């Protein structure tokens, strides 16, 4: 047809001829310095050795918000950088088994511990890692990247083909839209986007959560504006091709517009944003290097993404097309806008245009150690709190990733050594000098322990600084030269020589004018800076004065209103015998209207003792095997971190009663018993006592099902107060970890699961079958006993259904049940002809 | 033999024409039929037809219950499209893509319209299983390392765990319980043949009804998936792929209704005369 | 329970102290001994010792034949040396390296003289198996990917297929046939206990001799390896590692001679009186 | 002792921090042009 090139894959595979897995999604992060863990493998450095994160965030990274930038960078550049980094790296998804590296709030923190108590732990969960790297010291743990490491527009289209399919309309070569053709469609709501709740109101529905290529693209309205820009631009390119080539299909239009959009994105992200972030122009394209390794390093996550927080402001303006600022004060508070669902100011298309223009004409914050409170106090918390500390959780993520120190990273990259604390930043030491002293006091004057993030911020004066600039520039050069599909690589057949020039002469103002139909004289040529002549100046530098206050903190309680119903359910399950006893009572009422003696006993019942001993040792062996496996040999699946005593007590008795209930029919195989009664086996096994053995196996297998049911009553309680990110690791295919952390209620485990619902019926069947088959009622009414005792058919049916739907392990009851059932039914058929 | 060249046996190594676990069943039941045909002339002339039908239908039902379980033609789809073929090549091929969704996996077939197009032989038939003892994700990762053609991997990842279209859990559970019902129906067929040999008319006629009801229950379990793969797009270039009910579905329906009819006829004929 | 922190159970997860397939055997035979001790007061006073010895020795022999098979202490070696530890580190450790060559694999132990030296815990115990159902090369490649300490990999590759020191084939064949002889001896022990319960004195006394002769045959099979690992160097820095006969060798010798002596005593005492 | 460096391995493993298998013995030969076979494989 018209596709005369090799279309680029969505997941990044087969981009390199030799290393197929480079850049693919789910691939390792390849580090620059060997991992610095506590034991050499997978164990982070901690608070006795390194200072407290929340206590470090208060001494260095704290101050006012009216600090203008040195280079007059604009907010549009900051959030365009956030968008680019969402394209490149994503390491914020918690991994299995659930591991926690918590943040202990010091006593008296005026934010997270106002009413002064002792233990105000903020949860924090370690991220996903590669399953071939966590065991031995010459191969420490390596985390995995959730997106494609190439700069291939994996934030507009998705990191897989099945993801991109849910974004297209398959008509006109366009991405799917909603009621308004200027916004995406929020229809898919189950496994696409991140459904985190709004911290300021608690709303958590999928209504208003647009569908982008990045799973967390709705984090802020200001990061949403860039996604809307790149959505509208695709729908604009694929609509001009359909005007020039009216005979093209839908796949041709999509694959021709996607190519142009990716190339324009690469041009901007490399030759217009990078020269502004670093103030260094990258070297010109030498050609495709098939041997350069383009992998993302964990230090790049800190040098680029965690550094941008020093520039985020407290409020964001909105602007007319002709220098009018009162929302097309009228600024948006950043703390009150996290995971916003349907903002009453950003519902039309002109409103998003106004947001982009206001961001374009607003100068960002100064590049230094200070960070505004909308991030270090009111960041949306992922567990139990709804607010957290972004800096304290960035320090805890550096420790989780095993990142090097500051002086150790500054050495592997070939930078000059540093001896004193007053050498990290001589200008900062001359002006303030009270921040370096506080950092020294926190580290006990051990400069070789200062970690990567606090060091790179103290080193930054107006730009990222010597250490961060090096990492960022090297990473981007390796991403450009190592990618086969870079729009300048003339040997991939994407673009001709003239199209490459037409792309290399495109900017972000050209895109803001194409999407937002405004005159090009309403913006400045370089929208990443605002200089002394550009149009529509600020009203004033936007500090945190006049803006509305941030919404306060509230703690989420999962087991909030489940106290009364849980007690009723447990009491009802415990009152099953007391209703069958009443039914049997009224049924009967209506049916009426020295040592020598010891050794003598031993020598009498030698055979009975032997048989009972063998039976109970087999049941004990089964219990001990399961208890061993769950106590000493199952750590790779963190189930004993949630329930330890419960799961052992409930999975041992399971394997023992699977045997007691299966082999209880060999005591009622009457014809087989009467045939073996006269055999050499009679010297060993007393077949006269075959019913007394029935009542022994039966009355000792209910004392174990009570322990089973109680163990699972304890488990179901601990499963209904644990977060969703833990249950997603325990029971895959039954739970999926999206943003909204809330487990299923208790009654979902009891009445809406296969095991939980068959278990209650099993308890009822046993409560009837045991009370009616009692010596007090069997002696008074044989018909009632005989009718109720036929519940064993229903019992074995329920026992075969119960073990299915493999939740903890694959079923085993049918293995226990095959042989005795066959012997029993054969003996039953034999006793039918006679 | 004769060794005068290298290698000694210079010839193309063959491939088995059809599925193996189906040829085994066909050969087993043909062998049993041949054995009973050999024994047939040793029975009285009157009851020859009464034995022939009673053994042929019993064997046919027992074979269908077992072949439908391991079959992969419950829901099937097919389309002819032009797609890409491999990496590092801008060339497109004209193929016949197909889907075959069974109870414990899916078979994907890519076959060129001419089998020889790019100096290659495009006759693939790939299987990805989601049974309780298997892992779909590891099989897909292994089929991605070894580089299969592009459309095979597309259709293979549509069914992968944690995809925007949630087919994995639904198809896995439905296939699991349909397979369980089919095994129970096979057990009931065995017991029906046993309790029919020795003279028990009521119990045989009542086990045939169970043999039918469990097949219909398997149909009910598997039919809870058609409402899920309908909205998810299976576009392959300029062609869409629609799946409908395959032959195994209607075969199970037919034999289930047959067993139910036989059970009812036996019960009625046992009551009145 | 009580959920107020994260995780709920904050504690170190334990490890089993000893080998599992040996603790199983010890517990099984201790259980049998306890059962027979419970039954003991129900036997006549005279034959109490005659039953106690006859059951204790029979059980002990049956347990040794089974524990020596799965043991890994046929040929053992041990040395204390200073070696390198890991990659990307010029630091050396002071360890206690050891070898334990069984019948179907080898266990290598690296243990620091202080267990905590480089902020790590050096208490390794690694197993590489060459049984008929295993592949030593794949296990070594997997233990090379996952980066074990340097001396562990050195000693582990000494036994790898196609090494300049041909230990793989010899140890594999010798272990295979020694294990087969031990299984035959276990079967003979079972038959001896059976044909001793019912009154047959000659045949029991003649199966004990077989129980002994097959243990001695296992010794003969495994002793065809000592003449091969002697010249191959096992240098670990400044220390050499020499392997000699472990406890399982002498245990098998002792129980074999015991069974042979019992068989001869029974035969003689059956002839004259 | 006197060995104050990291002695070089004989089989070429762990020479690179990120790709441990580069240069090792028994490793693939990585080509410059896609393979030109008769059937593609
Ligand atoms: C659903 O589905 C399912 C699945 O499929 C199914 O089942 C199935 O069925 C069937 C029956 O029919 C089957 O299958 C089949 O088989 C066959 C046979 O096999 C055998 O053989 C083979 C071969 O080999 C050879 O070759 C190679 C290469 O290829 C090499 O390497 C080797 O070495 C050899 O070579 C030799 O020979 C040659 C000749 O031939 C010569 O020349 C040379 O020289 C030499 O001598 C083999 O391989 C195999 O083996 C394997 O397996 C086993 C078992 O499993 C194992 O053990 C081993 O080891 C191996 O394995 C491996 O691999 C795997 C993968 O594969 C993995 O997994 C592992 O791990 C390892 O690694 C045997 O022996 C075959 O042949 C076939 O195949 C085919 O097909 C498929 C699908 O379709 C695919 O995939 C493949 O690839 C193939 O395809 C191809 O070819 C064809 C022809 O034949 C064509 O047509 C196509 O198209 C393609 O083509 C392509 O390629 C080529 C090359 O390759 C070229 O040429 C072209 O051009 C293109 O490119 C199959 O497989 C069976 O039985 C069953 N099962 C299974 C499992 O398979 C079912 O049935 C369904 N269902 C329904 C209902 O339907
Ligand atoms: C001969 O030999 C043989 C062999 O050995 C023997 O046998 C044996 O024995 C024993 C008894 O006694 C045993 O074994 C043992 O076991 C144990 C347990 O296990 C369990 O657990 C584990 C753990 O896990 C954890 O951790 C990790 C890391 O490491 C991670 O990753 C995970 O996730 C977890 O985590 C968790 O937890 C923690 C705590 O702990 C926490 O912290 C966190 O957070 C979380 O939560 C696991 O792993 C396991 O699992 C596994 O296995 C299973 C089964 O097999 C499977 O299924 C799974 O999956 C897994 O697997 C994986 O891996 C593998 C390898 O390993 C592969 O193969 C596959 O494929 C996969 O991948 C369970 O669950 C353990 O622990 C041990 O280990 C140890 O040892 C060894 C040797 O020795 C080695 O190798 C290792 O490595 C270790 O070592 C280490 O450690 C120690 C302590 O413990 C120390 O001492 C040492 O030294 C070392 O250290 C190092 O490293 C570390 C780290 O790692 C560091 O820290 C330091 O510093 C250094 O560096 C063992 O294994 C058993 O029973 C048996 N068997 C077997 C097979 O093994 C015998 O006995 C002999 N013989 C004679 C006669 O003697
Ligand atoms: C797991 C199932 C099961 C449990 C639990 C069970 N039984 Fe039974 N019981 C049977 C079966 C099966 C029979 C055989 C009925 C038959 O086929 O006639 C039976 C038969 C009996 C009989 C009939 C003896 C006769 O005269 O033939 C008695 C009495 C009896 N059970 C007492 C008890 C008592 C007492 C209990 C416990 C309190 C108990 N059973 C628990 C399955 C069970
Ligand atoms: C009559 C005995 C019995 C009773 C009563 C019973 N269970 Fe079970 N349960 C079992 C057996 C047996 C298994 C293991 C089945 C297997 O391994 O095949 C089991 C397994 C389970 C499992 C694990 C199933 C899996 O997927 O591995 C859960 C969960 C469970 N039971 C919950 C409950 C709950 C909740 C109750 C009631 C409060 C309950 N059970 C009552 C016998 C019982
Ligand atoms: C025929 C006459 C008797 C035969 C008996 C011996 C056969 C061999 C035994 C193999 C067992 C095995 O190996 O168990 C393995 C499992 C765990 O496996 P793992 O350690 O993860 O696997 C690796 C195997 N290693 C270590 C050898 C490499 O351990 C267990 O279950 C321990 C659970 C306790 C069982 C309780 C029985 C106690 C008696 C009851 C008292 C009331
Ligand atoms: C680890 C635990 C250690 C246990 C040590 C102590 C065990 C104590 C056992 C007590 C034996 C006893 O007192 O006998 C009571 C009853 C009486 O039987 P009866 O002869 O009075 O009808 O006898 C019975 O209860 C019968 C039990 C054995 C009967 C075996 C019959 C086999 C049935 C047929 C199987 C196919
Ligand atoms: C600017 O805003 C005023 C009132 O807010 C409006 O009248 C005018 O049309 C706006 N300018 C443009 C170019 O839309
Ligand atoms: C980009 O193209 C325009 C259109 O002619 C041209 O005037 C300009 O010089 C080019 N280069 C720029 C804007 O840097
Ligand atoms: C930066 O912006 C301010 C006003 O916001 C302006 O006065 C100053 O001149 C600008 N910087 C430069 C270099 O022009
Ligand atoms: C494949 O290309 C040919 C060439 O024009 C065309 O005739 C055919 O319709 C195409 N196939 C499909 C499914 O469109
Ligand atoms: C591939 O096939 C074409 C047409 O049949 C032929 O011209 C060409 O030579 C073939 N190439 C090879 C490498 O056999
Ligand atoms: C290890 O080094 C110490 C330090 O001198 C030395 O005393 C010891 O002998 C060394 N070990 C061996 C086995 O030589
Ligand atoms: C390692 O141990 C030494 C001595 O015990 C100690 O000085 C050092 O701080 C430890 N390092 C770490 C990272 O715990």
Swiss-Prot record, chains B, C:
Residues modified by glycosylation: 82, 107, 119
Cytoplasmic compartment spans: 44-49, 203
Keyword annotations of the record: Glycoprotein, Membrane, Protein transport, Transmembrane, Transmembrane helix, Transport
Calcium is among the record's keywords: no
Assembly description: May interact with NUMB.
Topological domain ranges for the Extracellular compartment: 1-22, 71-181, 225-247
Name of the gene: Duoxa1
Topology within the bilayer: Multi-pass membrane protein
BP-aspect Gene Ontology terms: hydrogen peroxide metabolic process; positive regulation of hydrogen peroxide biosynthetic process; positive regulation of neuron differentiation; positive regulation of reactive oxygen species metabolic process; protein transport; regulation of inflammatory response; regulation of thyroid hormone generation
Claim: Ribosomal protein is one of the keywords in the record: no
GO cellular component, one term: endoplasmic reticulum membrane
Annotated protein name in UniProt: Dual oxidase maturation factor 1
Transmembrane segments: 23-43, 50-70, 182-202, 204-224, 248-268
Similarity annotation: Belongs to the DUOXA family.
Function noted in UniProt: May be required for the maturation and the transport from the endoplasmic reticulum to the plasma membrane of functional DUOX1.
Compartments it resides in: Membrane
